[PDB]
Design an enzyme around this catalytic site. Sequence first.
Site, PDB file in Angstrom:
ATOM      1  N   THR A   1       0.749  -5.969  -1.018  1.00 30.89           N
ATOM      2  CA  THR A   1      -0.222  -4.913  -0.767  1.00 30.89           C
ATOM      3  C   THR A   1       0.148  -3.671  -1.568  1.00 30.89           C
ATOM      4  O   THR A   1       1.311  -3.270  -1.600  1.00 30.89           O
ATOM      5  CB  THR A   1      -0.301  -4.566   0.734  1.00 30.89           C
ATOM      6  OG1 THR A   1      -0.461  -5.768   1.496  1.00 30.89           O
ATOM      7  CG2 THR A   1      -1.486  -3.653   1.008  1.00 30.89           C
TER       8      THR A   1
ATOM      9  N   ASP B   1      -5.362  -2.806  -4.058  1.00 31.31           N
ATOM     10  CA  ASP B   1      -5.478  -4.198  -4.466  1.00 31.31           C
ATOM     11  C   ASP B   1      -6.357  -4.964  -3.480  1.00 31.31           C
ATOM     12  O   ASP B   1      -6.721  -4.464  -2.414  1.00 31.31           O
ATOM     13  CB  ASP B   1      -4.101  -4.852  -4.573  1.00 31.31           C
ATOM     14  CG  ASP B   1      -3.337  -4.821  -3.268  1.00 31.31           C
ATOM     15  OD1 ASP B   1      -3.628  -3.950  -2.423  1.00 31.31           O
ATOM     16  OD2 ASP B   1      -2.451  -5.679  -3.084  1.00 31.31           O
TER      17      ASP B   1
ATOM     18  N   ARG C   1      -5.601  -8.318  -2.481  1.00 38.54           N
ATOM     19  CA  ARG C   1      -4.864  -9.496  -2.047  1.00 38.54           C
ATOM     20  C   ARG C   1      -4.440  -9.323  -0.593  1.00 38.54           C
ATOM     21  O   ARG C   1      -3.725  -8.373  -0.261  1.00 38.54           O
ATOM     22  CB  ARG C   1      -3.643  -9.732  -2.933  1.00 38.54           C
ATOM     23  CG  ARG C   1      -2.653 -10.712  -2.337  1.00 38.54           C
ATOM     24  CD  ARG C   1      -1.467 -10.934  -3.242  1.00 38.54           C
ATOM     25  NE  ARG C   1      -1.793 -11.758  -4.396  1.00 38.54           N
ATOM     26  CZ  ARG C   1      -0.934 -12.062  -5.357  1.00 38.54           C
ATOM     27  NH1 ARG C   1       0.308 -11.608  -5.341  1.00 38.54           N
ATOM     28  NH2 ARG C   1      -1.334 -12.831  -6.365  1.00 38.54           N
TER      29      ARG C   1
ATOM     30  N   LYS D   1      -9.666  -3.154   1.349  1.00 47.22           N
ATOM     31  CA  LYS D   1      -8.709  -2.350   2.088  1.00 47.22           C
ATOM     32  C   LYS D   1      -9.060  -0.872   2.123  1.00 47.22           C
ATOM     33  O   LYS D   1      -8.503  -0.143   2.951  1.00 47.22           O
ATOM     34  CB  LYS D   1      -7.302  -2.523   1.497  1.00 47.22           C
ATOM     35  CG  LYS D   1      -6.804  -3.954   1.553  1.00 47.22           C
ATOM     36  CD  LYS D   1      -5.454  -4.109   0.882  1.00 47.22           C
ATOM     37  CE  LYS D   1      -5.062  -5.573   0.801  1.00 47.22           C
ATOM     38  NZ  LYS D   1      -3.924  -5.799  -0.132  1.00 47.22           N
TER      39      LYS D   1
ATOM     40  N   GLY E   1      -0.488  -3.219   5.621  1.00 40.96           N
ATOM     41  CA  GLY E   1       0.314  -3.801   6.683  1.00 40.96           C
ATOM     42  C   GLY E   1      -0.466  -4.864   7.442  1.00 40.96           C
ATOM     43  O   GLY E   1      -1.052  -5.765   6.839  1.00 40.96           O
TER      44      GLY E   1
ATOM     45  N   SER F   1       3.459  -2.914  -0.143  1.00 39.34           N
ATOM     46  CA  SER F   1       4.612  -3.635  -0.670  1.00 39.34           C
ATOM     47  C   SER F   1       4.901  -3.232  -2.109  1.00 39.34           C
ATOM     48  O   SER F   1       6.065  -3.095  -2.501  1.00 39.34           O
ATOM     49  CB  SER F   1       4.380  -5.141  -0.566  1.00 39.34           C
ATOM     50  OG  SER F   1       3.131  -5.500  -1.130  1.00 39.34           O
TER      51      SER F   1
ATOM     52  N   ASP G   1       4.791  -6.761  -7.877  1.00 36.68           N
ATOM     53  CA  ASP G   1       5.029  -7.106  -6.483  1.00 36.68           C
ATOM     54  C   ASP G   1       4.304  -8.399  -6.149  1.00 36.68           C
ATOM     55  O   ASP G   1       3.134  -8.570  -6.508  1.00 36.68           O
ATOM     56  CB  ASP G   1       4.567  -5.987  -5.550  1.00 36.68           C
ATOM     57  CG  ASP G   1       4.767  -6.330  -4.092  1.00 36.68           C
ATOM     58  OD1 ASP G   1       5.922  -6.300  -3.621  1.00 36.68           O
ATOM     59  OD2 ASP G   1       3.762  -6.636  -3.419  1.00 36.68           O
TER      60      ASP G   1
ATOM     61  N   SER H   1       1.018  -8.319  -3.970  1.00 36.59           N
ATOM     62  CA  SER H   1      -0.165  -7.696  -4.538  1.00 36.59           C
ATOM     63  C   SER H   1      -0.706  -8.555  -5.672  1.00 36.59           C
ATOM     64  O   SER H   1       0.055  -9.167  -6.427  1.00 36.59           O
ATOM     65  CB  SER H   1       0.139  -6.290  -5.052  1.00 36.59           C
ATOM     66  OG  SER H   1       0.711  -5.491  -4.032  1.00 36.59           O
TER      67      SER H   1
END
Lengths: 204, 220, 226, 169, 242, 238, 249
Positions: free
Chosen positions: B1, B17, B19, B33, B47, B129, B166, B169
């Site tokens: 994330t 993102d 994902r 999101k 989260g 993340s 990451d 993501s």
Amino acid sequence: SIMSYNGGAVMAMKGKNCVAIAADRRFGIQAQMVTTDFQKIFPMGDRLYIGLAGLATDVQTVAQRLKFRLNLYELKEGRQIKPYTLMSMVANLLYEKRFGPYYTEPVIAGLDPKTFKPFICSLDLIGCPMVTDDFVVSGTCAEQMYGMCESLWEPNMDPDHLFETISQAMLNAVDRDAVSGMGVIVHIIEKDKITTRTLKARMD
Amino acid sequence: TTIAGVVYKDGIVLGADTRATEGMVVADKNCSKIHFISPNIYCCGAGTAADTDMTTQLISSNLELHSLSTGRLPRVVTANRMLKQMLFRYQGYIGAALVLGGVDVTGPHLYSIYPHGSTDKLPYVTMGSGSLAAMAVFEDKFRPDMEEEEAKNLVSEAIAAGIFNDLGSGSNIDLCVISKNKLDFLRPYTVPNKKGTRLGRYRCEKGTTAVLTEKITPLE
Amino acid sequence: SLTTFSPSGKLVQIEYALAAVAGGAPSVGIKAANGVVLATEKKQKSILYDERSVHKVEPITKHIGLVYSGMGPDYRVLVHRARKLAQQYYLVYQEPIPTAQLVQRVASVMQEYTQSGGVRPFGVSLLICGWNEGRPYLFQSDPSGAYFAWKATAMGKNYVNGKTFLEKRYNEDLELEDAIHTAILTLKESFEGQMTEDNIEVGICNEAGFRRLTPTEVKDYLAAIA
Amino acid sequence: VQVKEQSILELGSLLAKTGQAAELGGLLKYVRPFLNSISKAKAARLVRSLLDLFLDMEAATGQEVELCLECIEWAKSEKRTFLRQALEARLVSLYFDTKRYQEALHLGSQLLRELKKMDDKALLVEVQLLESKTYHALSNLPKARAALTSARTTANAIYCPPKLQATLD
Amino acid sequence: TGYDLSASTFSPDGRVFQVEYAMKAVENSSTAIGIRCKDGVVFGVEKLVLSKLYEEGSNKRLFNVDRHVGMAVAGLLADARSLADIAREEASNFRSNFGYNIPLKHLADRVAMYVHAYTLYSAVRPFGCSFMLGSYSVNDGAQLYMIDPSGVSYGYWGCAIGKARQAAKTEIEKLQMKEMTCRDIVKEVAKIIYIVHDEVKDKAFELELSWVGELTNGRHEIVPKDIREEAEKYAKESLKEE
Amino acid sequence: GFDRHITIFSPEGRLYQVEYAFKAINQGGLTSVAVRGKDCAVIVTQKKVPDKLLDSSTVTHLFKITENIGCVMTGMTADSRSQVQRARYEAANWKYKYGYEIPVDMLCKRIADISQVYTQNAEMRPLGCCMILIGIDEEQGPQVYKCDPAGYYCGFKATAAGVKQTESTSFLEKKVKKKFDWTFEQTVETAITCLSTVLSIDFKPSEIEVGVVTVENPKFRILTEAEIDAHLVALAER
Amino acid sequence: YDSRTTIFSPEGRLYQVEYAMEAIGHAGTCLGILANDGVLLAAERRNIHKLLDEVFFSEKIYKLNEDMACSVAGITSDANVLTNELRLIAQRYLLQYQEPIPCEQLVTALCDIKQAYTQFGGKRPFGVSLLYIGWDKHYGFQLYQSDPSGNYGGWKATCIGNNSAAAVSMLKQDYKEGEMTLKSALALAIKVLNKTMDVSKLSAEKVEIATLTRENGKTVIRVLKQKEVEQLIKKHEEEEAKAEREKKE
């Protein structure tokens, strides 16, 4: 895991003007086998079905509770529920017990009661909605049928091609899981009819 | 994330993102999101996805009932304030990491909010993340009084860096620029990654599966 | 108070309630093929008052609106309850509330508020408008809680003559927004001094939703039209 | 940014003050295509103001009657009713002034059915009076007297003889 | 009539008669005078003894609601005891929460709110006691306040309550208390009490005098016995010579 | 059981107790007037002292409800202070749970709802004071609002509250008919002359209370005696 | 402060329940007839006016569940609250037991709760009367009439209208025992609404008819359409043409 205590496998697939929803019929306690005639998909509309995998008691409890709230809703409104509205209701019901959650993965599949638009979504153990245009999943054999999705899906299925695709998908998914299978029930929901097929599977 | 926000000269630029993951597998390849809060304020969640959804929904809700009770446009720090009370009363058991961005009569406002209730004002914030890659991008490339398109490119490349550095993501990038005179929600800003093509044909032909029992129910 | 049944089987309290409402401000509602118009007259006691400070129409949401006849603070607290109730419907449901549902919610609220003892029952009547699923909706709610469906009605001072006038008018096929001019006529039949820029409030709910009219176009429709 | 909407002040006022008929019609067609860009209330008030600017100014009826007709067709494009009845009140006044005899009576079949849908008086009163006057202008006492009495049925309500009951007398 | 038996109903003219009856019940009681000196506040009350069988000093209307605050009572004594307890616990709660001596105006506001809350409903009657609060400190000077059962809290240089309140405040006004020190204030207050005793209208009486100020170091206390027993002494030289 | 004693509807629904409360407000023989200028607002209230024994600083009807808003009362004193403290409580609650200076209309609306729920039920006195707020709001300028015990309110360019209500309103209306950009010292001069011609007393400077809140000084302030007599001698010749 | 309204009469009865009875007496009119093949319920809706939208799909009829249905008379607000309570208790029974409530258990639950409402609390009773029509495996088609007093019973065909006893009398004089004959029952209802209602000519825009019948294990509940209602009406008035033929003989 407590999820993997009973197993259970629910799949729903989207077609051009139709939806498919399949589930394994195995019910047992871990490796012990109880019955090969358990119900996981429940009809709560003329074109709108819910598949439930997870804890079997939680499946039955939330099925009765959503039927409770659903017919209360439909008697209050005087109209049939929309699949998006049903998704909202499932999210609200499952989130009402955030500290005490039910152990199940709900799957919603159907058509629009007025426009016959296909609709498939899946919700987690706390009611987060995943509304998709291709496939939604539920179960202990999740990655098997994930591979079945990403290697068997193409847009605008015919209803029979939908049925065959999801049939082969669920069969090959449950053939590698020791806690899923014992016969697969498949519903194909289109505008004018619904066809339910019980597949011949592995019985071991 | 990976979610982020940048204050620029005319307002706020938010990016995220698409994902959404469960366990190790990615669940949603096009998850949204960035969440609707008010016609001048938006929030990006990270989260636990259901937790962020309910939190943004109910805070936003109290946002438009406040606006209807006042008959005026809402402000950002009030939203942040009841975010931080709602999170602090629950002692961080609800894991919603939030980026709040908006423009009100007092100007543009941007805040980063922790699930345990700590809130911070910064001209640029990153969360998720992949927060660190986007934070490095911002620390490399941010300057005060940024132009709109350059800030858009900066947020886009920071989210792309969080995607490509990451594991949590990936997939697409969505943007949202909030100004005093306008507000544009660029859901699919850019598509950096596409699904690979399929070589073999795995078409499950008709008649491949045998059936024990059948039923047909006609519908009115 | 713990009001009960008369020997005639009639509740004198709700009769007093509707009698107090009937002495209230005149107002009118009409349902045309493109939406619902609500309209009311506010006669400011002097020039000292600010017309823009307090309104008679309040948006519950983007597409629902309700005017009233009767008590003022009662009306505003009922606006609060209606807005909040519609909001928890949106909270559980994540879709905007249809009109008729919040109609029986507020009618129920009237039923307990005239049923529960200790509290004096409310002395207001409410008119509700909305655009749900393309079909417009307009309803009336009394203090007793019996909700009625009306495509054109008048509530408040001299409401019976307005009802007869909209019986003569209002063929219920006006696909355009000409019924707002009919509402202006209905109010002008009972208007005291003159049809001015601020005394008349008009609200529209169309396919785009419910939108309170700016007094600029109120003065515009006051001009030329009547 | 729409500030030319209210910009009929200079030229529209000078049309009446100086006095000219062709330029009024030229202005009427000048904002005719632009009229589908503003609010319907502004369009209605602007149309009414421009029409009653020259409907009393000049008797050069080589343009004005079809200007009224094209404004009726514009109203049917807008589908506005009370706008429409005001327009045929204006045309029947113009027709009585120009005295082209026949289709003034064809006004009545196109009026009475509309004016008995609603309990409307003032439009009904003036159309009955003008029909009676035109039918008297062809010098036939009986049916003109019948129309006069039919107008005299509406001998109630109103507020004054501003134009109406004095013309009745 | 039916519009005077409740504390929640209204008269047609816009009046409440329960609180008026409370005022009459208060003014039925005897007198009490609070006075503000240059340094502190002096309280002077007279109490009628009903019989010699009392062991003296019974039901003294002066109470120490705080170490630095004294108070005087006219009206009904049980309600006075309840209000004194409320004042004590509220000062306790203040100095527990805040950690310093409570200002007199603040506690006067709190007891005004408390006595006015009991006028709101009909389940509880209005009180039958009017009282005075006096205090002194170096941070704010000498403060005096008077509160009736209806809830009016007013400051005074010198205030009186009771049957002889008229002549009491009459003879309060004819003194320049802003220039006299506490020792003169004692003899003035004693003289006014002896004047307003009225002698024939009542039985034998007793005097109670209380002090707060810098002489008592800001801590409210009763007068010493040696400062006492001279009130009659300069009374007897100041009595009328017929 | 008839409603002449308790809050129930009547024949023609006349709630007698609320007009009774209005007469209870008019029982207290005092008056206040509020005038909003172009960028200022002023509240002028008269007071009476029966004797010199009472401390004149203790008697005050103007209260600093917040740092930017002022309020003034009319009715019985104790209920007035009680609802002052309630409005203070709600203002501080709004500031704590929202984080900004509450607009005047929101305080007005909330205590209007409080008055409504007072008069809604039985076993509760429906309160006997009327209220005036003066304040400044951003992009709005000065605001002057009034509340009754019945819970009604409105917006006013200028208003008044007290025993001598009607003539004050008539004078204020005939003055605002020629409004023409009221200025600060001119507003306070007009308010002083209005109160004077209503009372016909020609008051000395130490009988009045004036409170002015201004865009130039958004903090609400209290006028001292020196500027009071300065404005009086400014208005002495005119 | 004077409200007792809970005590028995000096002779033994209750003033409140009889005031409720005569409050129902001036309310609207609805009637029902049992049959072996089904059940019908016909009402006249009140306040029939040209400005009604009529968008509630027979508001006087309330489908309590998929099997058993309701009708109410009295105060509309109390009727709404009560019917919502019926929905709640019925669906609580469906939640506790995965089968429909038969007919009478929910009736007894309502009678209990309304008795508790007229036992204590010092509040007014709900002046609403209800008719319940349904099907069960235990007794087939079952009909019940719940008065606001709490008493209930199993009348085959009855009403709670403004002319309640009148239609009860014509039903008693003109009932055939054990004959379903649903068309004749509709004709019976048509002639009863003819003779009972003061208004004449039997405007289909003044009446509503709902039917319940067991079909394929579903107990379908329908509302008769306007065209069907007026067709049945016109067939009824043309039926009485041969009655006025004996005259002299």
